[PDB]
Write a protein that binds this ligand. Structure first.
Ligand SMILES: Cc1cc2nc3c(=O)[nH]c(=O)nc-3n(C[C@H](O)[C@H](O)[C@H](O)COP(=O)(O)O)c2cc1C
Ligand code: SF4
Ligand code: SF4
Ligand code: SF4
Ligand code: FES
Ligand code: FES
Ligand SMILES: [Ca+2]
Lengths: 146, 156, 905
């Protein structure tokens, strides 16, 4: 806002945009996008039936699009380096990179940015470093608790 | 009786400036009252309802819906240990047993002197550094059951 | 549209969801969270059917029929095995935490959850763990709370908050510890909170008044009746047991009061069960009170009335059309007086002239919900005509409905409708002497005296059409708000003007008629609604007669030496001292009434009339719809000494004994024919219900369910021999289960809803042509008058601005839902609910008097100094004093009257 990148007349275009940070009150169901809309309006975070989608009538009945942090962080690279660059990151049907990583009883639990199509054994045996000493690998969840 | 202070009312009104509906500041108003008083008492529901212009049933439903809005009195420090799946694999049971042995209370209860209140919480988003535990403002990771008394002593 | 259910083809409305479409066809789908009036939210997940993509589809997909539109060419299956297994699973999941309470639960035999547990065929419990419990709240005198029985279906909060507009009932908690109720112990503040006992499909919210004297639904003797508590005319099902009125259930009428009553009508029936009611004719002899039977009373009254030189009759707006007509026939047309004051009668006659001669269509109560703008002039509707306030709330939500309909959102998808229509609403402009209960949704509220409200109405009428008389002396900010109201009413497609006789001002009614005429002249589809006071105010106004003051002058001058008072306590319409003097002067007072009134001490003869539960008759509601109410039980069946006849039967037999010295207990249809012959304006009461010869394939209509029990032991303490079944010759109903109550029976008068498998109030779905619509084979009741071809003229009598003069306090009427209706006040459950009588004062007037909030002040009216504690009313204007109309000592005739000598006590 101090640099003129937010607020009124952003970079002389005339586009007015204001950005707020809404800190939640600790409930998992608020991550659901329609329930996120309900909790943003100060209601009990009950999700909403679709149709209608949030794109037609979302926050306070207005058109509203909900996106993840990582998607909105992927956007500026696309707008700065082009479209064919983003399509030519990986030779897969899922374009672009992704924040992946293994956690739980591994040598190096963490987060790394990898292209799509990277196998999970590659992540486990190269970035995570495999299981720790005296531990036999039994199962794995690819994408969290759900 | 209950009465909102000037600072609480000013903060609630400034939060009401950020939304096109005053109802949308209910969560933040409850959090403001909770920051100033430790928890949300019974008259605070009607006070926040009067400030925002929404029914007290709506404010009470929001207050009892969300886990981190306390409608019962707590201690001076809220111990919140993660009991989710990655911290289960990393062994939060030792942490919970150490906290129960040190504080001599069950989860959800408060000590006799009102120093700590023990609560399990959801995943703290620090699964690669588990087991984690969030005391009032600070998240502590890579926890061991022998480091619990040295960590609780700094919270007087 | 066209849907294919289980291989069979049906034609349904495409705007409907699949659940209501299939329920209209007669297909049984279990459901909990859906209600016809509340829309669809998809919570309980009970209505699951299997939808196929096309005709040659085998896999399908489980959908919720309440959330799925009934589009053209829609293939579904209800009785598929996967859908049945899922519905049984949902019932089982609801049963895991449900308490073992059915024997000790007031909803047993009336429970939608019981019916849907049986209907899904779930009867084997394989859950073995602990059941969650809950602590109950105290919700007041009317609604009992038992949160253990909750299935978390959100019907209560959706009704009470989204529909009823209440604010003190929500859902609190989380994952499966969801709790429904108030944030704290206290009385539910809604005037329509009593509909929760039928909205809730379990025993969480129960009728506490019914619970104190409880019996099951199969033991009830029901009848179709009309609520007697105000002028709206909501259809009710009173059910009795052991000779006392046990419960008032809602009776569905798709034209009037579809699923909902108000709390006055539902909980103010307890006056019928009072132990001081007259049960035999009583004739005084010196200081003694000799009890007579029917024939001795008729012969003695006929002899004394024959000796008297002139007998006058005083009717009442509580009595039915037949009883007032029978009194008019007994005393003569010229000697019949409507037992209401002259100003009250003038306002009632003006309201009648506006309704049936103003050329503007007066809507039914359900039709109110389809109007695009509402202007309420002078009428505190929530305390006098409460169902109209509920309908007005629906008409206000119509804007959100219209906005969602613009975005191709279905009308039953209520959550999306409320999301699109955040706080946008149709215009509502209410005017009153103080704050109304409609102020939370009103676009503007005008707190002003009745002169100023009438002036605002005339100013609106002049600004809409310049041919209307203008108002001089309008402040610029008030003129700007006038312009706001005019811009809202002129842009509306269907404006509605609601006034009534409760404001106590003729000019308020005139201003409302002027606004409606100005909107009619612009081409708008305007409607007008007058709110009367009592159950048969409109019928007594149509029949007509002199005022109560004229009858009092006749008694006081000595021209009348006999008076017959019909169902009139006479203190609510005239001063008690004058009434007592006139009645003590008259050498013969005969009181035909069903409640112990104060004038019975001066009565030479008291005839024990029947109340609505023990009598048949017709009443005319505020819109001019004739409605027949039927007798619920015979009072003489349990107590053989009780001589409690209909008022028209008493008066007709008295007329017969007066003329021919023989007693004639007539029939109801004979009196109906006499009314439609003598009074052509009331000719529509013939078609209100069919006569006593009406049969459904030869058999009568049953008053009680087929499983009615105790038939050989309910009177066994009196005598082991069973008595005769009471013969009903007045009507088409029978006093037994030997009758017809099929949902597919060609009739409009339904005593109660019951179908096999559907024991709850959801059994009304089988009795309608489509669910949530009209009753099958039409709703009961007929409009007496049609809309006139040409309207009235503009009322040019514009009142002046209200001016406060010293030593004269204008009485501003404050009505209360619990306490302004006389028979409701008599009900013992309203004593704990009605407020203490507070006299309302402006802060400036109380400061001038030196009076603070709570100090008791005394005022003299009609030479009677009475003291009341003071409540400070900010919205009241200076020079006015607020009084609770109808309560103890304060008659409704005092509305608009002046007050003298208001000092601190
Ligand atoms: C139970 C549940 C929890 C969810 N929690 C989150 C969450 O915490 N963060 C998130 O970004 N999406 C979450 N989602 C996914 C959202 O519904 C939505 O897909 C996402 O927030 C935005 O979509 P996007 O991936 O295109 O950006 C959750 C979904 C469900 C059903
Ligand atoms: S609510 Fe219904 S199922 Fe539950 S205890 Fe009562 S009658 Fe039985
Ligand atoms: S209290 Fe009754 S209406 Fe409300 S959610 Fe529970 S079962 Fe449904
Ligand atoms: S609105 Fe009037 S007629 Fe209807 S239930 Fe209430 S008191 Fe009875
Ligand atoms: S599982 Fe404990 S921090 Fe995520
Ligand atoms: S009736 Fe359809 S989900 Fe409840
Ligand atoms: Ca009868």
């Amino acid at each position: 806002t101090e640099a003129g990148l937010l607020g009124k007349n952003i970079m002389g275009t005339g586009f007015d945009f204001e950005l707020f940070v809404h800190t939640g009150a600790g409930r998992y169901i608020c991550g659901e996008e329609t329930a996120l809309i309900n909790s943003l309006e100060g209601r009990r975070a009950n999700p909403r039936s679709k149709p209608p989608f949030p794109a037609t009538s979302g926050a306070w009945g207005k058109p509203t699009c909900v996106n993840n942090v990582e998607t909105l962080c992927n956007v500026p690279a696309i707008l700065a380096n082009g479209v064919e660059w983003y399509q030519n990151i990986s030779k897969s049907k899922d374009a672009g990179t992704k924040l992946m990583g293994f956690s739980g009883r591994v040598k190096n639990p963490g987060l790394w940015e990898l292209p799509f199509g990277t196998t999970a054994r590659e992540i486990l045996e190269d970035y995570a470093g495999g299981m720790r000493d005296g531990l036999k690998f039994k199962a794995w969840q690819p994408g969290g608790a759900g | 009786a209950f009465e909102l202070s000037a600072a609480e009312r000013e903060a609630i009104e400034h939060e009401m400036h950020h939304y096109e509906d005053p109802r949308a500041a209910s969560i933040e108003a409850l959090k403001i009252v909770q920051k100033q008083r430790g928890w949300v008492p019974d008259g605070a529901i009607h006070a926040i309802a009067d400030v925002l212009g929404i029914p007290a049933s709506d404010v009470e439903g929001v207050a009892t819906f969300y886990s981190q809005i306390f409608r019962q009195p707590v201690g001076r420090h809220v111990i919140r240990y993660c009991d989710s799946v990655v911290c289960h694999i990393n062994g939060y049971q030792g942490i919970q047993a150490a906290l129960e042995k040190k504080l001599n209370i069950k989860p959800g209860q408060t000590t006799f002197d009102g120093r700590f209140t023990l609560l399990p919480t959801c995943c703290l988003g620090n699964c690669d550094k588990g087991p984690n535990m969030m005391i009032d403002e600070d998240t502590h990771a890579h926890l061991t059951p022998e480091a619990i008394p040295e960590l609780l002593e700094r919270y007087k | 549209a066209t849907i294919h259910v289980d291989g069979k083809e049906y034609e349904v409305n495409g705007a409907d969801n699949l659940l209501e479409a299939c329920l209209s066809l007669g297909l049984d789908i279990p459901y909990f969270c859906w209600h016809p009036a509340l829309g669809s939210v998809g919570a309980c997940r009970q209505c699951a059917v299997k939808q196929y993509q096309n005709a040659e589809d085998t896999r399908g997909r489980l959908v919720m029929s309440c959330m799925t539109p009934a589009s053209d060419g829609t293939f579904i299956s209800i009785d598929d095995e996967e859908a049945k297994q899922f519905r049984e699973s949902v019932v089982e999941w609801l049963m895991t935490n449900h308490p073992h309470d059915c024997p000790v639960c007031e909803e047993g035999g009336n429970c939608h959850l019981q019916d849907m547990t049986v209907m899904t065929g779930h009867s084997f419990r394989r859950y073995r763990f602990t059941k969650r419990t809950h602590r109950n709240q105290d919700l007041g005198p009317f609604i009992s709370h038992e949160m253990n029985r909750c299935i978390a279906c959100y019907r209560c909060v959706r009704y009470y908050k989204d529909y009823a507009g209440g604010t003190d009932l929500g859902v609190y908690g989380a994952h499966d510890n969801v709790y429904f109720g108030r944030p704290e112990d206290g009385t539910l503040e809604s005037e329509f909170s009593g509909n929760l006992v039928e909205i809730c499909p379990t025993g969480v919210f129960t009728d506490k008044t019914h619970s104190e004297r409880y019996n099951r639904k199969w033991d009830m003797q029901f009848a179709p009746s009309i609520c007697q508590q105000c002028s709206i005319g909501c259809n009710i099902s009173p059910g009795e047991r052991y000779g006392e009125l046990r419960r008032i259930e809602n009776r569905y009428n798709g034209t009037v009061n579809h699923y909902f009553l108000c709390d006055r009508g539902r909980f103010g029936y307890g006056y019928v069960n009072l132990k001081d009611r007259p049960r035999q004719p009583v004739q005084r002899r010196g200081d003694d009170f000799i009890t007579l039977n029917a024939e001795q009373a008729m012969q003695g009254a006929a002899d004394i009335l024959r000796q008297s030189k002139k007998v006058i009759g005083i009717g009442s707006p509580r009595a039915s059309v037949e009883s007032n007509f029978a009194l008019r026939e007994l005393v003569g047309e010229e000697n019949f007086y409507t037992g209401i004051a002259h100003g009250e009668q003038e306002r009632l006659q003006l309201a009648l002239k506006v309704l049936r001669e103003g050329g503007i269509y007066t809507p039914a109560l359900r039709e109110i919900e389809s109007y695009d703008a509402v202007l309420v002039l002078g009428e505190d509707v929530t305390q006098t005509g409460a169902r109209v306030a509920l309908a007005v709330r629906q008409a206000v939500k119509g804007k959100a409905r219209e906005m969602a309909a613009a975005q191709k959102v279905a009308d039953w998808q209520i959550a999306a409708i409320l999301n699109i229509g955040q706080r946008a609403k149709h215009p509502l402009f209410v005017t009153n002497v103080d704050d109304t209960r409609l102020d939370d949704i009103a676009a503007w509220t005008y707190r002003a005296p009745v002169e100023d409200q009438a002036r605002l109405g005339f100013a609106i009428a002049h600004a809409l059409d310049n041919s209307a008389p203008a108002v001089d002396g309008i402040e610029p900010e008030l003129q700007s708000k006038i312009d706001v109201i005019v811009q809202a009413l002129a842009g509306a497609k269907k404006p509605l003007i609601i006034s009534g006789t409760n404001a106590g001002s003729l000019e308020v009614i005139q201003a409302a008629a002027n606004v409606a005429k100005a909107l009619k002249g612009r081409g708008a589809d305007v409607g007008i609604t007058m709110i009367a006071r009592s159950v048969n105010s409109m019928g007594l106004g149509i029949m007509g007669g002199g005022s109560l003051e004229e009858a009092l002058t006749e008694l006081e001058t000595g021209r009348a030496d006999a008076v017959v008072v019909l169902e009139n306590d006479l203190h609510r319409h005239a001063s008690a001292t004058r009434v007592n003097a006139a009645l003590a002067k008259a050498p013969l007072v005969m009181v035909v009434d069903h409640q112990r009134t104060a004038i019975m001490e001066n009565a030479h003869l008291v005839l024990s009339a029947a109340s609505f539960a023990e009598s048949d008759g017709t009443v005319i509601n505020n819109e001019g719809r004739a409605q027949r109410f039927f007798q619920v039980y015979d009072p003489a069946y349990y107590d053989s000494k009780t001589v409690m006849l209909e008022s028209w039967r008493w008066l007709h037999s008295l007329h017969s004994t007066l003329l021919s010295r023989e007693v004639d207990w007539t029939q109801l249809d004979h009196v109906i024919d006499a009314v439609v012959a003598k009074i052509p304006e009331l000719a529509g009461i013939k078609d209100a219900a069919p006569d006593a010869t009406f049969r459904i394939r030869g058999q009568k209509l049953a008053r009680e369910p087929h499983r009615y029990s105790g038939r050989t032991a309910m009177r066994a303490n009196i005598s082991v021999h069973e008595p005769r079944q009471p013969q009903d010759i007045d009507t088409m109903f029978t006093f037994s289960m030997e009758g017809n109550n099929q949902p597919t029976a060609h009739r409009s008068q339904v005593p109660f809803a019951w179908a096999p498998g559907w024991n709850s109030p959801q059994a009304w779905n089988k009795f309608q042509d489509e669910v949530g619509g009209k009753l099958r084979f039409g709703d009961p009741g007929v409009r007496l008058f049609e809309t006139s071809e040409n309207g009235l003229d503009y009322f040019t009598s514009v009142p002046a601005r209200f001016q406060p003069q010293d030593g004269k306090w204008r009485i501003a009427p404050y009505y209360h839902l619990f306490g302004s209706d006389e028979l409701s006040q008599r009900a013992p459950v309203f004593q704990s609910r009605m407020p203490q009588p507070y006299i309302k004062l402006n802060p400036a007037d109380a400061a001038k008097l030196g009076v603070n909030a709570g100090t008791r002040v005394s005022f003299s009216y009609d030479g009677n100094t009475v003291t009341l504690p003071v409540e400070i009313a900010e919205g009241l204007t200076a020079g006015q004093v607020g009084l609770p109309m109808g309560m103890s000592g304060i008659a409704p005739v005092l509305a608009g009257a002046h007050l003298e000598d208001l000092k601190e006590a």
